[PDB]
Tab-separated table of C-alpha atoms and ligand atoms in Angstrom:
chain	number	residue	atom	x	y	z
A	83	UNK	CA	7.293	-1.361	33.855
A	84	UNK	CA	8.133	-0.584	37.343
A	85	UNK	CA	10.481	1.560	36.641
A	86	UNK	CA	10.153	4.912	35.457
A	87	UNK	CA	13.524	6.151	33.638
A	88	UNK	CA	14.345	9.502	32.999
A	89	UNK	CA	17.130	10.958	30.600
A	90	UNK	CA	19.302	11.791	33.214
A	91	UNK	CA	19.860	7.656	33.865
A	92	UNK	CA	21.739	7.209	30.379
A	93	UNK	CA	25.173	8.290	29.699
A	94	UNK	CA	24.050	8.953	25.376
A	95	UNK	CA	26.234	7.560	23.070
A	96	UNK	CA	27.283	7.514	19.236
A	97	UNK	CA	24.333	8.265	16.448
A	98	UNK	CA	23.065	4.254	15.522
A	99	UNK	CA	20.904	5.494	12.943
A	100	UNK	CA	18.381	7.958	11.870
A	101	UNK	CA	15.063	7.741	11.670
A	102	UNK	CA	11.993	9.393	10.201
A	103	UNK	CA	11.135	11.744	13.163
A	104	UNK	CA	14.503	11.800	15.361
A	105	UNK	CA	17.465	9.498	15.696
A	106	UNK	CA	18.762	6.417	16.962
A	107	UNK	CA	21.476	6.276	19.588
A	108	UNK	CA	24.025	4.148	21.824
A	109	UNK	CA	23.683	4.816	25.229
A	110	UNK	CA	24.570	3.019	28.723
A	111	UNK	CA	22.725	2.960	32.248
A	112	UNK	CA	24.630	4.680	34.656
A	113	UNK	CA	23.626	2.400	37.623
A	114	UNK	CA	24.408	-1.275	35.843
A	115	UNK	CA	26.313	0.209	33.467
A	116	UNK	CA	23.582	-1.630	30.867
A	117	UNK	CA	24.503	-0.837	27.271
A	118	UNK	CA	21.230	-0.159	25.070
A	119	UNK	CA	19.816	2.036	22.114
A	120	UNK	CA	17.868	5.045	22.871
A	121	UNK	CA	15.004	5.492	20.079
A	122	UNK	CA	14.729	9.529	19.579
A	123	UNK	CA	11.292	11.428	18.679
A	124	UNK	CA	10.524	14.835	18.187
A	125	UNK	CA	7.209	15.415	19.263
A	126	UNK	CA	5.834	18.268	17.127
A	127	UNK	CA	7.294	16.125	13.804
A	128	UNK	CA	4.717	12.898	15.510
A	129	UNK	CA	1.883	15.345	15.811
A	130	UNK	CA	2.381	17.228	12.923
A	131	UNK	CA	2.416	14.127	10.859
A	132	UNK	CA	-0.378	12.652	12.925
A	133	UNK	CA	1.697	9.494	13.373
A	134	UNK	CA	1.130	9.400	17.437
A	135	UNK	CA	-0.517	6.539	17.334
A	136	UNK	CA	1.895	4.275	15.104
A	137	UNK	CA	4.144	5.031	18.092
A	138	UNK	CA	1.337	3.661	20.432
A	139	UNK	CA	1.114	0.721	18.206
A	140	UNK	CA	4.882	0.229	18.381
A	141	UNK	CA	5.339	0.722	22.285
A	142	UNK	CA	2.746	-1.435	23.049
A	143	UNK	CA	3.292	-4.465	20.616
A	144	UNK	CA	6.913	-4.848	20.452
A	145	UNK	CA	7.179	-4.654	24.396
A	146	UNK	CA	5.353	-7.660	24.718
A	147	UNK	CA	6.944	-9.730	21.910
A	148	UNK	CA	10.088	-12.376	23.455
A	149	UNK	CA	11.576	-13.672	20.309
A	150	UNK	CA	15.146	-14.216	19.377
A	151	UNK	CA	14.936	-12.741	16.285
A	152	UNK	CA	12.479	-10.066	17.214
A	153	UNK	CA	14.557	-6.998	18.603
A	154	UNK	CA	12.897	-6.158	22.188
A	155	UNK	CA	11.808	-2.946	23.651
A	156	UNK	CA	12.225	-2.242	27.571
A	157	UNK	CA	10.324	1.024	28.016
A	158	UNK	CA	9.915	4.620	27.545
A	159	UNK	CA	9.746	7.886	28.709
A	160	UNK	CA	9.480	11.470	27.784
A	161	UNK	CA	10.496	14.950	28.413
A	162	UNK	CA	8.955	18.442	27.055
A	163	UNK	CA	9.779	18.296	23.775
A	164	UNK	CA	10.429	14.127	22.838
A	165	UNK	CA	9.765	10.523	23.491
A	166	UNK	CA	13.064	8.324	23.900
A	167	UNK	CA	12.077	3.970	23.528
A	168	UNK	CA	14.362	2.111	25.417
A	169	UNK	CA	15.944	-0.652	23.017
A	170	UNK	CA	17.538	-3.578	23.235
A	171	UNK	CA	21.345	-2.695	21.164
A	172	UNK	CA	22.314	-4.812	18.055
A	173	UNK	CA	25.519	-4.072	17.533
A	174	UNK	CA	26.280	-5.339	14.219
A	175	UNK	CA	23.944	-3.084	12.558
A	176	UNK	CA	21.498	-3.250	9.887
A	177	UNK	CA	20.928	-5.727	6.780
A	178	UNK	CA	20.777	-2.860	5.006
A	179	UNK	CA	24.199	-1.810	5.526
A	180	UNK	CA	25.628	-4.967	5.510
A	181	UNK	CA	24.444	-5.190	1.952
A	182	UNK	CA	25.739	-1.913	0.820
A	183	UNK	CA	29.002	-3.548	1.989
A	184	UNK	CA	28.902	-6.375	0.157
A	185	UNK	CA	26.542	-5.667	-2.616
A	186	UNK	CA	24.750	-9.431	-2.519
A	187	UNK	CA	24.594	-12.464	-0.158
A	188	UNK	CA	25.633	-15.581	-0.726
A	189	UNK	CA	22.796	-18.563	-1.242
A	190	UNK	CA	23.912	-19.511	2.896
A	191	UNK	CA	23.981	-15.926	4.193
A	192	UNK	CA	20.135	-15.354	2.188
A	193	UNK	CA	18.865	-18.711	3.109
A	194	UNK	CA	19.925	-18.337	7.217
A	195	UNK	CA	18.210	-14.579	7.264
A	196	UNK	CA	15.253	-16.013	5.317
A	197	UNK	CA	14.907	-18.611	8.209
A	198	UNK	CA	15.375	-16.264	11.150
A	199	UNK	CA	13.183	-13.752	9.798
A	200	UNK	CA	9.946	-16.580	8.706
A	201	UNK	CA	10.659	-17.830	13.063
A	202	UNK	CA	9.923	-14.050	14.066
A	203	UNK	CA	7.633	-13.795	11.637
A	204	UNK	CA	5.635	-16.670	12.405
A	205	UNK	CA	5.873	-16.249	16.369
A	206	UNK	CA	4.137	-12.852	15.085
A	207	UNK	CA	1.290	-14.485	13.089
A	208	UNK	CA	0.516	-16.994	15.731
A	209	UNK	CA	-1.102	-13.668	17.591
A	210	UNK	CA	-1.925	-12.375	14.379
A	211	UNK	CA	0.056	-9.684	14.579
A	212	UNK	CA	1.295	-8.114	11.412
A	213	UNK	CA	4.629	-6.332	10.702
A	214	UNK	CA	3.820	-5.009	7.216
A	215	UNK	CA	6.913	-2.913	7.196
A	216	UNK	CA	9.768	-5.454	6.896
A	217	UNK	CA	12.387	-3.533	4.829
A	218	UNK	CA	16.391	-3.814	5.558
A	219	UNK	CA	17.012	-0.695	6.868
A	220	UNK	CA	14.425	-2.176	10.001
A	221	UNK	CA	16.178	-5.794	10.009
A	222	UNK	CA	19.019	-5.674	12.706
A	223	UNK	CA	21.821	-8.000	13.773
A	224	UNK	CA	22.704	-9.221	16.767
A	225	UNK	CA	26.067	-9.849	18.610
A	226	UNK	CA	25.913	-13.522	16.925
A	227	UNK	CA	25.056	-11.805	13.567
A	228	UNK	CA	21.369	-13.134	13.958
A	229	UNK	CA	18.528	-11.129	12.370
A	230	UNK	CA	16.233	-9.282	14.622
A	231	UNK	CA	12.975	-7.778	13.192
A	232	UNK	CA	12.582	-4.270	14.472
A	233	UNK	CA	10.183	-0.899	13.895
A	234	UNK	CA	6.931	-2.625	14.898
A	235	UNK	CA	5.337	1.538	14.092
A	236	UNK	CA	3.326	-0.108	11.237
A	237	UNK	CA	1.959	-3.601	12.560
A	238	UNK	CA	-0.968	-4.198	13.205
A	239	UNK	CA	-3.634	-7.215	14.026
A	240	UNK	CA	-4.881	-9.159	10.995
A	241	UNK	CA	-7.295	-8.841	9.306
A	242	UNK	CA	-6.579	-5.154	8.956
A	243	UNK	CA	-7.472	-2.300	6.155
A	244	UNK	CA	-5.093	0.903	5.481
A	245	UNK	CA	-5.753	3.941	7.166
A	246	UNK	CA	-2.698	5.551	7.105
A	247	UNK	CA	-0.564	7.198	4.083
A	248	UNK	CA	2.019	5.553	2.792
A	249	UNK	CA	5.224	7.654	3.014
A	250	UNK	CA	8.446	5.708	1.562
A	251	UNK	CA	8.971	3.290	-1.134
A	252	UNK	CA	6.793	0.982	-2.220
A	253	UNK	CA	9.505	-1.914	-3.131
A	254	UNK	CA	8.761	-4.057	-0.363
A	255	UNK	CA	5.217	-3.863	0.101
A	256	UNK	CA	2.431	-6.188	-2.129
A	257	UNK	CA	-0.475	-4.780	-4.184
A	258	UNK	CA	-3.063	-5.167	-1.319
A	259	UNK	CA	-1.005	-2.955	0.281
A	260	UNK	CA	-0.408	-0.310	-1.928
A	261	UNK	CA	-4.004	-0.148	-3.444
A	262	UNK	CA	-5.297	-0.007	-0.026
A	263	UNK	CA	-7.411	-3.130	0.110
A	264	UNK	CA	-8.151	-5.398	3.049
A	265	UNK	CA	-4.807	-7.836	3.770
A	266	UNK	CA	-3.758	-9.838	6.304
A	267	UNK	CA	-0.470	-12.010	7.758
A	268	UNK	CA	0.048	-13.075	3.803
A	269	UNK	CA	1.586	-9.376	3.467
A	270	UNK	CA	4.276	-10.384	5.179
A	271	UNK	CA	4.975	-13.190	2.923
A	272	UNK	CA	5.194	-11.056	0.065
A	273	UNK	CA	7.790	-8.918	1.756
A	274	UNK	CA	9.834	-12.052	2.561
A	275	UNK	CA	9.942	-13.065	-1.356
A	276	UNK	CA	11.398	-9.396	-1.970
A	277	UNK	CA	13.916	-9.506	0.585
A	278	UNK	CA	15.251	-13.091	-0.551
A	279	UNK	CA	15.370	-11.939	-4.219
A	280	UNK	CA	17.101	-8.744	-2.879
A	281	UNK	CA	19.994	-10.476	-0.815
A	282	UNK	CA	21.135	-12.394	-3.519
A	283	UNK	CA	20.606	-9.819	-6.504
A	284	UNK	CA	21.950	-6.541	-4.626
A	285	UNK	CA	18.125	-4.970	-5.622
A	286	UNK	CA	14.823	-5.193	-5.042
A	287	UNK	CA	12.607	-7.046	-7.673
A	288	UNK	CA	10.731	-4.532	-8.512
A	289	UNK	CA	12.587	-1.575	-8.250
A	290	UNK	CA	12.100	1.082	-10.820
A	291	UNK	CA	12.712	5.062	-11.238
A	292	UNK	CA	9.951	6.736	-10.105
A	293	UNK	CA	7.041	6.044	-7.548
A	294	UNK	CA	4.358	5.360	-10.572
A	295	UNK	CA	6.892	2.857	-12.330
A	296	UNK	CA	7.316	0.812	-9.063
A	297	UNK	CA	3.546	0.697	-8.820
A	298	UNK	CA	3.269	-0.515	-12.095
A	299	UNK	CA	5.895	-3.324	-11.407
A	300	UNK	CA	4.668	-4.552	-7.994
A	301	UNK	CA	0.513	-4.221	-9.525
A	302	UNK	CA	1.692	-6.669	-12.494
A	303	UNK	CA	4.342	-8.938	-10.456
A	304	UNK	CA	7.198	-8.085	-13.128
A	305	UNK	CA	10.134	-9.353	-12.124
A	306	UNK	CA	13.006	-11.238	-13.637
A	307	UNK	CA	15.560	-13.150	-12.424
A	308	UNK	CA	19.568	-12.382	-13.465
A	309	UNK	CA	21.328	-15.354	-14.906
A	310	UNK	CA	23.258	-16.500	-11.625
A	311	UNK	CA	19.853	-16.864	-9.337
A	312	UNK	CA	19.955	-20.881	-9.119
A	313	UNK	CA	16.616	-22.802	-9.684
A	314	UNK	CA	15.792	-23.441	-5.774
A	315	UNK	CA	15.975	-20.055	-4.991
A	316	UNK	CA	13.642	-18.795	-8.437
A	317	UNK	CA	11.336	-21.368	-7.257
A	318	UNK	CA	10.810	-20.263	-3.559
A	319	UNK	CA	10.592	-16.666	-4.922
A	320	UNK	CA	7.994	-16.931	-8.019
A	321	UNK	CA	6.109	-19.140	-4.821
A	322	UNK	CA	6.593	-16.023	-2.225
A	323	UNK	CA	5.738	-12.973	-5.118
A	324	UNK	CA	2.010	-13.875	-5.927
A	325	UNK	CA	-0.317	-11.198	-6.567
A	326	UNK	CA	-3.136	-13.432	-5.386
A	327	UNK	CA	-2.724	-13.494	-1.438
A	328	UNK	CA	-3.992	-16.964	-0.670
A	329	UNK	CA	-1.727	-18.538	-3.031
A	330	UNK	CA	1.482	-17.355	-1.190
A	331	UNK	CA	2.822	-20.147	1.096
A	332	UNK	CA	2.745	-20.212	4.804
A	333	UNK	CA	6.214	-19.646	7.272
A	334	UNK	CA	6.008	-23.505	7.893
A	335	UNK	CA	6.379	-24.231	3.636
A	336	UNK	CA	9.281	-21.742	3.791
A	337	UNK	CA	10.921	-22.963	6.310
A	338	UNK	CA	10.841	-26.396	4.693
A	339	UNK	CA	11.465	-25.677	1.289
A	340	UNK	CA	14.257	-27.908	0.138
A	341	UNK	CA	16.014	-24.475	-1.096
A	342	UNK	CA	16.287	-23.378	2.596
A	343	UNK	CA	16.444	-26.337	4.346
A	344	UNK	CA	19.798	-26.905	2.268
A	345	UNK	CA	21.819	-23.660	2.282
A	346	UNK	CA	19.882	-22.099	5.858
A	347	UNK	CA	22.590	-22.739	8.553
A	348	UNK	CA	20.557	-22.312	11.608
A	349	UNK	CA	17.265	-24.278	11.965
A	350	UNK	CA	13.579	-23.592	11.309
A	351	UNK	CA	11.535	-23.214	14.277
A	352	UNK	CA	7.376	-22.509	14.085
A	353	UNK	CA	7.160	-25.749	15.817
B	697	ADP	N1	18.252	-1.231	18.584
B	697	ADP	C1	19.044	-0.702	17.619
B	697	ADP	N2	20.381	-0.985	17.549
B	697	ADP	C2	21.163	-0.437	16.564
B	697	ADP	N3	20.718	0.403	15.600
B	697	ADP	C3	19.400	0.729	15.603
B	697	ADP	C4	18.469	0.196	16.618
B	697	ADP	N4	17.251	0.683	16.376
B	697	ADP	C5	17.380	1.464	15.301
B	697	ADP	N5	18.655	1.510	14.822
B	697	ADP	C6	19.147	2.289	13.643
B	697	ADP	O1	18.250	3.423	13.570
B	697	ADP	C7	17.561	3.402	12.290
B	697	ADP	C8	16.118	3.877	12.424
B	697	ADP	O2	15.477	3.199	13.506
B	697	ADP	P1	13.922	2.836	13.430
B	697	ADP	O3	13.616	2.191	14.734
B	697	ADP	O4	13.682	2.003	12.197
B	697	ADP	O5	13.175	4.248	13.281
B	697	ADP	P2	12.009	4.742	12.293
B	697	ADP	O6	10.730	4.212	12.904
B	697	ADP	O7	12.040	6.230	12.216
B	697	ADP	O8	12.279	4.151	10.919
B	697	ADP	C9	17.668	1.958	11.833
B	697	ADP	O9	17.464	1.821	10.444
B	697	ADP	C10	19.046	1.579	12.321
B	697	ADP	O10	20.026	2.116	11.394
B	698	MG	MG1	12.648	2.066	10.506
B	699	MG	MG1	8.753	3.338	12.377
């Protein structure tokens, strides 16, 4: 802290994004001339959805996180009507977009993200701190292309339970998670096999229709795997999708799986 900002300081910028209760947007210090992203929230949607204290969660968690691949948060401040968090800018967008562009990853492109995301990741375990809400649209890139984990609103310390209503889809999230039962760090885990089987298919693993469907799907673990998916990455992904928590790997088997180790560009790290 030590510096309390105020609207006024930022010269607001072009829409990033949009988010659940306000939007996302460029914006520059008018003193350094600092360029960042200004996190918008409406205050009667927080309260209203009784969501106030995810964005406790997320203030206070994120801010004192220092990872590469973990997308910081300077501060915050608030007027009458909203709360603005003070981001650090990624400028090449999300993983989500980039995969609307091109549809599916190649077996380099997956592997490197997969990598990146299992550091943050297990930088985030080592305080037991879990995202539980690792999706695309909340994956961001940086200047260098690298993945930065961002949207810490659902994390929480391990073990945890689930208080809080579930609001999106449930294609990313395991069946400890949807069925409300105790979990831990091994959520995470889960999430990462969905994302790597969704970079290099173009959809998630599980995805379905409706809301009940998907349930069905994630509570059973079907999946199946299209005819180009090679062997190394089916193996690493029957591995990461396990209903059975325990028996997913840890980060450190990920990072050294012989799948990743030989298409990942950039090297593993929870050293
Ligand atoms: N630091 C950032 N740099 C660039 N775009 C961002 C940044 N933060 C968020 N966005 C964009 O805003 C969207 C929503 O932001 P997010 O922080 O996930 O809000 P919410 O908690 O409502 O989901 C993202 O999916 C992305 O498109
Ligand atoms: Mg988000
Ligand atoms: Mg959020």
């Amino acid at each position: 802290k030590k510096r309390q900002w105020a609207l006024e300081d930022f010269e607001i910028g072009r829409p990033l994004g949009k988010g659940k209760f306000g939007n996302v947007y460029l914006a520059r210090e008018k003193q350094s001339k600092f360029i960042l992203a200004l996190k918008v929230l409406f205050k009667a949607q927080l309260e209203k959805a009784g969501v106030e204290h995810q964005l406790r969660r997320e203030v206070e968690i994120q801010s004192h996180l220092r990872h590469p691949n973990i997308l910081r948060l300077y501060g915050y401040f608030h007027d009458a009507t909203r709360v603005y968090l003070i981001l650090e800018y990624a400028p090449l967008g999300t993983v989500y977009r980039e995969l609307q562009k091109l549809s599916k990853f190649d077996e380099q492109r997956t592997a490197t993200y997969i990598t990146e995301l299992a550091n943050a990741l297990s930088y985030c375990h080592s305080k037991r701190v879990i995202h539980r809400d690792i999706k695309p649209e909340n994956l961001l890139l940086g200047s260098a292309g690298e993945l930065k984990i961002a949207d810490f609103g659902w994390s929480v310390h391990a073990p945890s339970s689930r208080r809080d209503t579930l609001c999106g889809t449930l294609d990313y999230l395991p069946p400890e998670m949807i069925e409300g039962r105790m979990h831990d760090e091994k959520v995470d885990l889960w999430s990462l096999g969905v994302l790597c089987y969704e970079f290099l298919v173009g959809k998630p693993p599980f995805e379905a229709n409706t809301y009940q469907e998907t349930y069905k799907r994630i509570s059973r673990v079907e999946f199946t795997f299209p005819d180009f998916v090679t062997e190394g990455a089916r193996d690493l992904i029957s591995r990461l999708l396990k209903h059975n928590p325990s028996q997913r790997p840890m980060l450190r088997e990920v990072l050294e799986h012989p799948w990743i180790t030989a298409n990942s560009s950039k090297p593993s790290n929870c050293q």
